[PDB]
Design a protein around this ligand. Structure first.
Ligand SMILES: COc1cc2c(cc1-c1c(C)noc1C)[nH]c1nc(C)nc(Nc3cc(C4CC4)nn3C)c12
Length: 108
C-alpha cells in the first residue's frame, strides 16, 4: 500500500513524540512572559512547537511532508539557540529529536 507522508507525520510521528515523557514543554508555544524570559522573542525569530505543528497538519497548512519536517527542525533548533549546550531543556529536546529522526527513518 502507498503511504500518505503528511498523514504519517500526524498519525505516527506526532502521536509518538506527543506521548514521550519529555514532550510536555514542547506541546504549546513557549510562553516567555509567563516563564519570565523577556528576551525570548528577541533571540527566537520563528517560534515553533508541537501544538502548532499538530494544528497545521489538521488544517492542511503544509504543501508537503518536508515543510512539516522543517517546522519540527525549527522547534528543536530554536531550543538549541535560546538555551545552552547541556541545559535540561536541551537534553529533553535532543532526546525528542533523536526519536523524531528514528520515526522519519521508519517511514514505510
Ligand atoms: C526551560 O525551557 C522551557 C520551559 C518550559 C517551556 C518551554 C521551554 C523552552 C525554552 C525556554 N526554549 O525552548 C523550550 C522548549 N514550557 C513550559 N511550560 C510550563 C508551564 N512550564 C515550564 N517550565 C519548565 C520546564 C523545564 C524543563 C526542565 C527543562 N524547566 N522549566 C522552568 C515550561
Amino acid at each position: 500500500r502507498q503511504t500518505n507522508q503528511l498523514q504519517y507525520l500526524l498519525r505516527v510521528v506526532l502521536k509518538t513524540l506527543w506521548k514521550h515523557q519529555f514532550a510536555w514543554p514542547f506541546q504549546q508555544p513557549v510562553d516567555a512572559v509567563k516563564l519570565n524570559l523577556p528576551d525570548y522573542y528577541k533571540i527566537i525569530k520563528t517560534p515553533m512547537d508541537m501544538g502548532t505543528i499538530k494544528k497545521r497538519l489538521e488544517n492542511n497548512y503544509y504543501w508537503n511532508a518536508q515543510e512539516c519536517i522543517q517546522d519540527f527542525n525549527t522547534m528543536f533548533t530554536n531550543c538549541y539557540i535560546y538555551n545552552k549546550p547541556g541545559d535540561d531543556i536541551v537534553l529533553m529536546a535532543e532526546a525528542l529529536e533523536k526519536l523524531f529522526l528514528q520515526k522519519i527513518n521508519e517511514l514505510p
